[PDB]
Design a protein around this ligand. Structure first.
Ligand SMILES: Nc1ncnc2c1ncn2[C@@H]1O[C@H](COP(=O)(O)OP(=O)(O)O)[C@@H](O)[C@H]1O
Lengths: 145, 197, 326, 342, 348
């Protein structure tokens, strides 16, 4: 198992003719945009996102990594993939393999956060509505007497 | 020679073949032998075009991309081309059992995972067959290797190499694994990581 | 009594109507805010303020491009930090900077990963020790008996801070990667050559006061890396505090007491405003509502009184800024 | 078989926080779904009805209607789909994850400008569609997958209060006492029907089964696929109508009231057809069983709830994918629900 | 009679709320008990199966196995006892109240330290015992009336996955691919059997019957005096093997020269792991992960009929009715439970 091909010790393993002649090399590399999209689609399919209006944007095809965008979830997946690529570009990783760890962790955090935030929003709105109804009923009763 | 041996192994453990089946099998073996070491996507596309040109020139067939060829013996009694979704469902249930039995890890199953475990399977099914997996960290290398070894009934030996360890401890681990493999016929899958050297 | 109650609750009615109007905008910006906060939490832990700003700019470009509305006035501390958390952290000894508040929020909201603390000033060890009190156990990779003490802490359920993080020992990889095995109602992890029980009251923190150290690639991709590096605002604040303490301690103590008391008063006011709505929602009332209203007015009056000193402290701050800048 | 009749007492008694507004029945499992005025959604196990299997505050105001469906894909995995409409002006589409016994919000439908009244679900070869009606006198049609609307029209001068779907034709009942049949895909009015003197409460087709009204009369009606319909209003009268055959892209014309059932002391609220008989709840705290052949009341469940009786549910008997079990559920204004089994 | 072979389609279809992990048949009445991964416990009348007769959620996790027994008291009143084991590390004993059509818990048995994976019930003259195995590598014996343990032995290095009981002998398969037969009351191992390459899923004796059947007739008068000769096993190896048990030195004693089994036949043809096996007359039925049920002929060792795609997922368990016992009449029916949250019933 080799994570960094260009290390001092790992390049010695890859170069070593004793290993290189017997082993079968499987260059797994890093994830492509299709694998990223599949994983993100699977994780964000259990969180309440499509609870609001959404106007489908008009963007170039090469900027889209999922299927053609039809809902908010596709937009979210594309945004996450794009930001991961941009972050790895700015941090000047170069050709070094890019772990998908940040991507996966961000996805899990987003799920865990959206759940609670949506629940809190609707519960607070329900409380406000009940309070308003109580006040209106009390006003009606006062006007009765 | 590797390509010849792979073709023989696939034929000897396969159903009644047809010309199209033979050609697709040969293409799959060529993929596994040659193109698994390729790094860039451009090189992989060039290799796919090379396969198409070779087949047209010498052996005048569906789409023979890497993900369009799925040969496995995990779903039947013989090595044959399998359907994608059946393999996905089978792997999902098997991985649920694996998590419930050995180590619980929340793994999401995608297509490249299926391909990688298929090729790890064909490599661990061979005789004197070893792997060198190269990829970024947290891409499921060790987890998939353990899963496939569990599928094939191997015994996994991850060396417990830590800080303040020397040649004696590694030698003891190696000698123990070798002695088990010989005197007890315990088919073993030894996972050596770069952090252990 | 009914008319007086309605007149007292008119303010609550105004707030509730405002909230009802703002509901649609809040629901529209919810997903964008959540995306921004999650990315802030999982990426920005190891970047300075300038890099955080640039990445926020990039992320907001992306959000705008794909038609995902967000809060134009977004601010990480406002969205993900509550007043109770701020008070507890400050009482524990955390610096008053906003950067440290963001980093502490990042550290304390990581239930999955293990927070790695790059803290050259060794302040966070004391801060966390104050936060967890007696449970805190201090270890380091450079000592003997480390493995046995770690096993005892895991079995018992202490909070563990391991120092010298640049000398990582791979014997704790199972704890780092959370590769447990569930045995009925028991959870076992394999440290060394024998399994131990995981209490569930056990947390792990890795501390290292050495920037430009070395983190093995196995550890770096599995921990939440957070930086605690001094910046301009912290230096200015510390310099001003020392200057005021050595110039006139009376103003220093008075300012600190007023600040703490104001924070407590705002917290209590928020609690009262929540409790009134809960009392209405859980329906005697004509009595409890008036008691809560009177308490709210008393606290508001005290808060209004407490604001008569801040101009003096602003003048003092303006009188001492040159020292901080230089 | 189809002649089962409920006993004189309910087998189960379920208590909730608020007035029950809609009750549905899981097509395959012994599970009942309950919606209240507090916007909370309940799932109750029919054998342990002291604690909900799951609960959820779905809306911020009262829920007005709901509907369920077990998807049938000929390619994917099938699951139960729950759709609810409330006074929030929003429609929420949930999914019942029986593996974990919990809910799963998929998406929400937006666009109605005022309180929504009724919803419906149905499946084509592989397409799932939804329907809705609101006080803004609009009837909207939605795509379950994409989530955006596919059709919109105004079939009533006043506001629609109830709809039902059958193939490509939708019949709507408004606060104005007239019913109306329209052709769904093209949005063309086909005919109307008058005779009630109070706002309609329910309206639904009568489906052809292998009975007096469930059998086609002519061959042209056989080709069309439907002949009759039923409705109930605050007139305290239930009427069986007849749909004049259109100029078959249909082209338009009056519903012939060929029957009338009376006896309820207050507004008739909900109706449901199970084989021969016909069940109807009303505000008089009663449930009536009407013989479709004779047109006479057979059995009465008096004083079932202290308050009004809001809704009834019975398993569909004319669908090859819905086995008609022997159970029904009644939801009442008094925070209680009654379940009859076997 | 006994040559009844099920038809090409089931006569019932039962829908449940989770994956079916174990199924059983009432030995007297047309009633089926079904277990699920939620720990629920159902009971369907076999002619009106659209509603359960009763339901019960006694466990907090997945039920792994269950077994039934109709008590035969010679001098008390008879009833039906149902026992279920789950991953709750517990075993629950129920009584089926027939007239009210309800379940009635009796007690729970504690003591196992990890996942319990099998249970068995059998009756002596007027005694009832329960056997159970778990991941703690211990096979325990319990008393139905008292409720406390009576024996506890560890016969395997890995964890025991399946057991069967014939008189005073218990044969056990384990996660290790080896079988083992021990004498229950004395708790002493007698003989082992190896040859499988994957963990054992099921194992049971082949009881003697009067008729001719290949493996259901003794070979020597010693076997007639000992009452059993053959056992059958199923493993994740996609194979079914018939073993012939060596004779011990009758408390028995392991004869060193005769302490190993002898696989006399191996049945192949399944595409994946074999999950359950059952024997009726001259036929052996099996279900596997390949979504199919086989029917082998015990004489020729061949597959007579195949039920392809009976379930859309894995087929977890079978159940036929015991024929070697006089008190249980072998009715013509069998039930299958699968991962697709459905159970099929074949009748007549
Ligand atoms: N498909 C996936 N879905 C979810 N997590 C994944 C996936 N692939 C890899 N991971 C992550 O990678 C880790 C497991 O992979 P592992 O084999 O331990 O890593 P490596 O071998 O690359 O060091 C976990 O953190 C896991 O979340």
């Amino acid at each position: 198992t080799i994570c960094d091909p260009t290390n001092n010790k790992s390049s010695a393993m890859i170069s070593s003719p004793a290993l290189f002649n017997r082993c079968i090399i499987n260059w797994m590399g890093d994830w492509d945009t299709k694998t990223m999209s599949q994983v993100a689609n699977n994780m964000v399919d259990v969180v309440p996102m499509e609870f609001t209006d959404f106007i489908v944007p008009e963007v170039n095809k090469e900027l889209v990594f999922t299927e053609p965008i039809q809902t908010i979830r596709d937009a979210v997946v594309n945004i996450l993939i794009h930001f991961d690529r941009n972050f790895y570009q700015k941090m000047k990783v170069g050709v070094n393999p890019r772990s998908p760890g940040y991507f996966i962790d961000g996805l899990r955090a987003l799920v865990k956060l959206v759940t609670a935030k949506y629940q809190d929003l609707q519960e607070n709105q329900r409380f406000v509505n009940v309070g308003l109804e109580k006040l209106n009923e009390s006003v009606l009763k006062v006007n009765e007497l | 020679t590797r390509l010849v041996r792979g073709v023989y192994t696939a034929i000897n453990t396969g159903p009644r073949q047809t010309l199209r089946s033979l050609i697709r099998l040969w293409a799959y073996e060529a993929w596994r032998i040659f193109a698994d070491r390729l790094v860039g996507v451009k090189e992989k596309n060039s290799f796919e075009q090379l396969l198409y040109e070779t087949v047209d020139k010498y052996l005048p067939l569906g789409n023979i991309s890497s993900t369009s060829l799925l040969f496995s013996g995990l779903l039947s009694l013989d090595f044959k081309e399998v359907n994608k979704t059946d393999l996905v469902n089978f792997i999902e249930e098997r991985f649920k059992t694996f998590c419930d039995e050995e180590l619980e890890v929340p793994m999401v199953i995608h297509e490249s995972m299926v391909d990688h475990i298929l090729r790890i399977d064909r490599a661990l099914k061979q005789v004197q067959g070893h792997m060198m997996l190269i990829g970024a960290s947290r891409t499921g290398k060790t987890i998939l290797t353990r899963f496939v070894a569990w599928l094939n009934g191997l015994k996994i030996v991850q060396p417990k190499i830590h800080r303040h360890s020397n040649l004696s401890d590694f030698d003891m681990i190696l000698k123990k694994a070798i002695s088990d493999c010989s005197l007890k016929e315990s088919r073993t899958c030894l996972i050596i990581d770069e952090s252990n050297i | 009594r009914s008319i007086s109650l309605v007149k007292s609750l008119t303010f609550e009615k105004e707030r509730w109507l405002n909230t009802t109007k703002q509901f649609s905008k809040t629901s529209q910006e919810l997903i964008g805010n959540c995306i921004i906060s999650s990315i802030y939490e999982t990426y920005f832990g190891h970047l300075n303020e300038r890099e955080r700003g640039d990445m926020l700019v990039i992320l907001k470009r992306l959000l705008g491009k794909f038609a995902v509305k967000y809060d134009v006035n977004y601010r990480f501390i406002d969205y993900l930090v509550t007043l109770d958390e701020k008070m507890k952290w400050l009482e524990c000894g955390l610096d008053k900077n906003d950067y440290f508040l963001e980093n502490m929020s990042i550290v304390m909201n990581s239930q999955d990963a293990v927070p790695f603390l790059l803290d050259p000033s060794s302040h966070m060890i004391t801060v966390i020790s104050n936060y967890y009190g007696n449970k805190t156990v201090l270890l380091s990779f450079l000592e003997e008996g480390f493995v046995k003490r770690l096993e005892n802490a895991v079995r018992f359920g202490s909070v563990v801070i391991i120092q010298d993080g640049e000398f990582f020992d791979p014997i704790i990889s199972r704890l780092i990667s959370r590769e447990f095995n569930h045995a009925g109602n028991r959870v076992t992890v394999e440290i060394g050559d024998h399994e131990v029980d995981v209490s569930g009251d056990f947390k792990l923190f890795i501390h290292s006061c050495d920037p430009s150290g070395d983190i093995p690639i196995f550890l770096r991709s599995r921990v939440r890396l957070v930086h605690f590096v001094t910046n301009k605002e912290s230096i200015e604040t510390r310099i001003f505090d020392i200057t005021l303490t050595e110039e006139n301690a009376e103003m220093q103590r008075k300012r600190e007491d007023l600040i703490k008391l104001n924070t407590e008063y705002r917290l209590k006011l928020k609690n009262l405003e929540k409790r009134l709505l809960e009392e209405l929602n859980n329906s005697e009332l004509m009595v409890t509502l008036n008691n809560l209203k009177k308490e709210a007015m008393n606290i508001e009056k005290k808060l209004s009184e407490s604001e008569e000193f801040f101009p003096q402290f602003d003048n003092l701050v303006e009188e001492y800024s040159i020292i901080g800048k230089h | 078989v189809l002649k089962w009749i409920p006993r004189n007492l309910p087998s189960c008694l379920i208590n909730v926080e608020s007035s029950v507004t809609s009750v549905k029945l899981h097509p395959n499992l012994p599970i009942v779904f309950v919606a209240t005025d507090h916007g909370k959604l309940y799932a109750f196990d029919l054998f342990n009805y002291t604690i909900p299997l799951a609960s959820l505050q779905s809306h911020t105001k009262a829920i007005t209607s709901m509907d369920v469906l077990f998807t049938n894909y000929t390619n994917k995995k099938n699951y139960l789909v729950i759709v609810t409409a409330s006074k929030d002006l929003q429609i929420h589409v949930f999914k019942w994850v029986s593996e974990e016994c919990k809910f799963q919000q998929i998406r929400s439908l937006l666009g109605h400008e005022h309180i929504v009244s009724a919803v419906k679900i149905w499946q084509k070869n592989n397409d799932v569609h939804i329907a809705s009606c609101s006080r803004d006198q609009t009837v909207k049609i939605w795509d379950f997958h994409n989530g955006w609307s596919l059709k919109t029209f105004q079939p009533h001068s006043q506001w629609v209060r109830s709809i039902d779907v059958l193939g490509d034709y939708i019949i709507s009942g408004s606060h104005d006492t007239t019913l109306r049949l329209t052709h769904w895909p093209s949005g063309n009015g086909l005919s109307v029907g008058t005779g009630h003197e109070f706002p309609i409460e329910k309206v639904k087709f009568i489906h052809f089964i292998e009975i007096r009204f469930r059998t086609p009369s002519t061959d042209r009606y056989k080709n069309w696929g439907m002949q009759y319909c039923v409705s109930a209003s605050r007139d305290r009268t239930i009427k069986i109508w007849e749909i004049p055959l259109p100029t078959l892209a249909p082209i338009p014309s009056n519903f012939r009231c060929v029957l009338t059932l009376k006896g309820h002391l207050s507004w008739v609220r909900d109706i449901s057809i199970r084989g021969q008989y016909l069940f109807s709840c009303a505000d008089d705290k009663s449930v009536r069983c009407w013989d479709l052949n004779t047109g006479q009341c057979l059995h009465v469940w008096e004083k079932l709830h202290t308050g009004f009786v809001n809704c009834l549910d019975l398993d569909v008997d004319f669908d090859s994918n819905v086995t008609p079990r022997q159970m029904m559920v009644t939801g009442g204004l008094d925070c209680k629900s009654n379940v009859f089994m076997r």
